UniProtKB/Swiss-Prot annotation:
One Pfam family from the record: Amidohydro_2
GO molecular function: 2-pyrone-4,6-dicarboxylate lactonase activity
Protein name per Swiss-Prot or TrEMBL: 2-pyrone-4,6-dicarboxylate hydrolase
Temperature characteristics of this protein: Optimum temperature is 50 degrees Celsius.
Associated pathway: Secondary metabolite metabolism; lignin degradation
Amino acid sequence: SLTNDERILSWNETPSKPRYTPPPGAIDAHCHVFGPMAQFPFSPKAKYLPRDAGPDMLFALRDHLGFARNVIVQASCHGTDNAATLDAIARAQGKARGIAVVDPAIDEAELAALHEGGMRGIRFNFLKRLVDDAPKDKFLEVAGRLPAGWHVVIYFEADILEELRPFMDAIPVPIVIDHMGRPDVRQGPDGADMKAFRRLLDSREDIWFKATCPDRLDPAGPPWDDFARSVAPLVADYADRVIWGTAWPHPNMQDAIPDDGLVVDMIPRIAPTPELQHKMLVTNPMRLYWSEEM
Ligand SMILES: O=C(O)/C=C(\C=C(/O)C(=O)O)C(=O)O
């Protein structure tokens, strides 16, 4: 254990109110909880030790920004121990669903227990700066024995997309891509990375993506105009396959801490019409995470 003070703050403690008002039932489909470490320790394999960011803080943020629901995504700092994430879902009293990280050896019963606890998929992280090992064969095997209706969430960088194509084509359930596979948004909406990512989207009908993280992808900083110009055409072209999230509490972003109000204000830039906003924030995430309500 490290004290909270000793650990890394990566979020804005007093974020601006967004100028944009999200519609009723809006889902922040990419967020995390960290600890609280006193009850839920970090993984021995964690590559960062963040400050506590618990459910009460997450819900306060959710309310402040005007969102109705969250998808709480197991963070790499907690490894395959989903306890913190599971506790947050429990505390959300129905307003949250989850994504887990699992030992590929996890048994049928343990997966069932994760489903009851509100998980609707598992995450595969191909960023070496976050996770050392990524056994594709084992990943494929676990993906083939998930509870009915689960998907897989995949996080990778643009420079390994081509290498990952055979793996992704073999995944036997739907796929959600974190942060569009980190394209270089400086290139424009028809740049090399976006062309490659579109080839991936065009290969299977059931690949969804998060149109997220201008803070991570656009080194100019706010208003992140390159992200806006490069991402908006992608949203428009794949309107039925796009979801969105804040990425709060922004692990690893301590050197460029984003204002969540500004993060939310990207929404009407990449989704300029009411219909696009409703698809990205309500209809699409509902089909993935609350299909029983659709
Ligand atoms: O969580 C994200 O969306 C982004 C990052 C962190 C993780 O993926 C994680 O630790 O689980 C990152 O890019 O550092």
